Design an enzyme around this catalytic site. Structure first.
Site, PDB file in Angstrom:
ATOM      1  N   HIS A  46      49.359   8.154  -9.253  1.00 15.68           N
ATOM      2  CA  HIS A  46      48.923   6.846  -9.084  1.00 15.68           C
ATOM      3  C   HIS A  46      48.371   6.152  -8.378  1.00 15.68           C
ATOM      4  O   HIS A  46      48.368   4.320  -8.625  1.00 15.68           O
ATOM      5  CB  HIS A  46      50.540   5.900  -8.978  1.00 15.68           C
ATOM      6  CG  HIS A  46      51.575   6.117  -7.984  1.00 15.68           C
ATOM      7  ND1 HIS A  46      50.625   6.908  -6.794  1.00 15.68           N
ATOM      8  CD2 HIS A  46      51.686   5.528  -7.263  1.00 15.68           C
ATOM      9  CE1 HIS A  46      51.353   6.589  -6.421  1.00 15.68           C
ATOM     10  NE2 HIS A  46      51.992   5.361  -6.371  1.00 15.68           N
ATOM     11  N   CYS A  67      53.821  11.960  -7.161  1.00 15.37           N
ATOM     12  CA  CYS A  67      53.696  10.502  -6.938  1.00 15.37           C
ATOM     13  C   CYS A  67      51.880  10.237  -6.278  1.00 15.37           C
ATOM     14  O   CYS A  67      51.395   9.360  -5.611  1.00 15.37           O
ATOM     15  CB  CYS A  67      54.152  10.262  -6.171  1.00 15.37           C
ATOM     16  SG  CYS A  67      55.797  10.008  -6.407  1.00 15.37           S
ATOM     17  N   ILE A  68      50.779  11.166  -6.669  1.00 17.09           N
ATOM     18  CA  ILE A  68      49.681  11.580  -6.033  1.00 17.09           C
ATOM     19  C   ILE A  68      48.789  10.374  -7.789  1.00 17.09           C
ATOM     20  O   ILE A  68      48.382   9.693  -6.315  1.00 17.09           O
ATOM     21  CB  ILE A  68      49.070  12.956  -7.215  1.00 17.09           C
ATOM     22  CG1 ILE A  68      49.934  14.192  -5.599  1.00 17.09           C
ATOM     23  CG2 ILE A  68      47.884  13.271  -6.105  1.00 17.09           C
ATOM     24  CD1 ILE A  68      49.916  13.964  -4.110  1.00 17.09           C
ATOM     25  N   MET A 101      60.011   7.116   2.707  1.00 28.38           N
ATOM     26  CA  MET A 101      59.215   8.078   2.818  1.00 28.38           C
ATOM     27  C   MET A 101      59.927   8.937   2.010  1.00 28.38           C
ATOM     28  O   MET A 101      60.026   9.897   0.815  1.00 28.38           O
ATOM     29  CB  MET A 101      58.087   7.671   2.694  1.00 28.38           C
ATOM     30  CG  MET A 101      57.277   6.460   1.358  1.00 28.38           C
ATOM     31  SD  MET A 101      57.284   6.139   0.073  1.00 28.38           S
ATOM     32  CE  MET A 101      56.865   4.578   0.017  1.00 28.38           C
TER      33      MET A 101
END
Ligand SMILES: [K+]
Lengths: 323, 323
Positions: A229, A226-227, A158
């Site tokens: 989703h 990417c918060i 990540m």
């Protein structure tokens, strides 16, 4: 007229690609060959392998498959059969930012494929467990703790995806920060991600604001990498409403980084974008949205409009305009 | 320039195709829709499902994937989104010889995919167990006994593949029996398979001869349908030597039905032929041979030559000529 039947046969055996490739990564075949500097014979390749003696025949039959997948090459040099790397295998070599070896080890882990066998129980009601929990009897948190290595690799994964996302952002979308003097990175935790912005644009003050959660700040622009989703529509619109009030009427904006599903698209990542959504559903419980779904969220948040920019990544960028 | 990276990403997620398709077969989506006679909405399709209530959203996200795979169709009819079958899905409908639903349920069984996770241990020496035995702690025989349903489906599967093989044989390759008045079917067990020949060519006396094995007969031609891909080279040549002596110098022959691996081939079944070989290696311990390997076996058996005929099946036909 059997191409039809062949598509389906190949779909049935789609897992063979995943798992042959898995063994190639496990055996680190591509690196070894590249590190050798010259194409290797069966026995040469065999002797570079972790344990001994090697089953030459199994190795040959797996190579033949890798070569047919067009990831590896087979060539006759002198009286010897020598194996090299076809272009796609550059992502199977260590020491560059796009190395996919970790991704591969993670995604093709037997336990991490496991939840895909519970797609049917995802659809039929039995239950509240995730497909993951149903296949492994624990939640990921727990799981990861009991598998610290898999976890370490996963985190590094990540962390590396964020570098690549952030980097494509500042390089490909720098014009999006024109005029901006402050930015709040929501969900940016430590601030590693936003730091890419502070570094590239020293004239911009970058703040991180993580949301309280169970186990606001004003700026010219707000960022969410990417918060969203992960949040359902309720939460998404609320957050998007807070963001409106936090940025200026005169030019303020929210920059969203997330996948845009577009099934009617010929872009190479379309398939994978779809796959990430089923993966979301199986593990996290979020979803990936179509442009229409983004439109509606933004519209329901009281925004004027939005602009989508494509970048060299799975995700896309949505500049959402509140006023 | 990211088509390269996309191939690899799609190879990594090749298992998603297998497992989405698996759920569609499990939920019997294609039959239901075809049996409906008209394309179905989400809720209509949902209500036809084994248990209730159904998670519409999961079903929608899986449909979207099936539709993107081009197995299913999505169409707007009136103000409703309706799902149909793209052409490849005909093999997902019951009631015809080419129905692949059983194949699918078998091949994508979690336990039957399991051995593909031991490709690396197939290559590295630890052991004498099959990948199957390593993943399930039993041998197949035992396994099948403890899973009689999976076994019943599996047998019906093999029985059906033999009908299709035999049928393509008598229909596509009937000229191969010209002049022949007797034939021995080696490994034909009950005689179901050879019976197709006795039926199509009543003037031919068909004998079955199974080989003694641990847990000859004279004819114009000998037949071996999927026998040899189980025996190694030693056994293959011996059997092929017995067959020479059993058939007449003047025109006698051996008809072999088995896969011919040809990696340099653009035939749609090439991939699957390769896959069947790795599957062989993981489960049975046999292999599938290239034409060169067949050539050499036959040559080493003292034969004059051979002729390969392609048929509408995974396997091919080799007429091997002893004199
Ligand atoms: K699996």
């Amino acid at each position: 007229n059997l191409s039809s039947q062949a598509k389906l046969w190949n779909f049935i055996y789609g897992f063979a690609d995943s798992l042959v490739l898995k063994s190639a990564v496990q055996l680190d075949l591509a690196n070894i060959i590249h590190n050798h500097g010259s194409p290797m014979t069966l026995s040469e390749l065999s002797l570079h392998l972790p344990s001994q003696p090697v089953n030459q025949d199994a190795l040959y039959r797996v190579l033949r498959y890798l070569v047919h997948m067009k990831l590896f090459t087979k060539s006759s040099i002198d009286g010897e059969l020598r194996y090299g790397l076809a272009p796609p295998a550059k992502f199977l070599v260590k020491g560059w930012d796009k190395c996919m070896l970790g991704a591969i080890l993670t995604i093709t882990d037997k336990d991490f494929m496991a939840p895909w066998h519970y797609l049917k129980e995802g659809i039929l009601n039995d239950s509240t467990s995730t497909a993951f929990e149903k296949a492994l009897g624990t939640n990921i948190w727990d799981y990861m703790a009991e598998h610290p290595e898999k976890n370490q690799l996963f985190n590094e994964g990540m962390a590396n995806d964020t570098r690549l996302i952030m980097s494509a952002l500042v390089k490909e979308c720098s014009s999006m920060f024109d005029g901006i003097t402050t930015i709040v990175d929501v969900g940016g935790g430590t601030g590693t991600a936003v730091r890419n912005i502070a570094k590239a644009f020293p004239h911009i003050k970058c703040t991180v604001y993580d949301l309280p959660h169970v186990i606001i700040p004003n700026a010219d622009a707000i960022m969410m990498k990417c918060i969203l989703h992960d949040w359902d529509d309720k939460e998404c619109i609320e957050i998007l409403k807070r963001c409106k009030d936090a940025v200026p009427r005169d030019g303020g904006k929210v920059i969203i980084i997330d996948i845009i599903l577009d099934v009617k698209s010929e872009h190479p990542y379309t398939k994978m974008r779809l796959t990430l959504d089923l993966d979301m559903m199986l593990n996290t419980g979020g979803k990936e949205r179509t442009e229409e779904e983004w439109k509606k969220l933004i519209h329901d948040a009281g925004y004027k409009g939005y602009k989508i920019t494509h970048i060299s990544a799975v995700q896309s960028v949505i500049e959402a305009y509140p006023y």
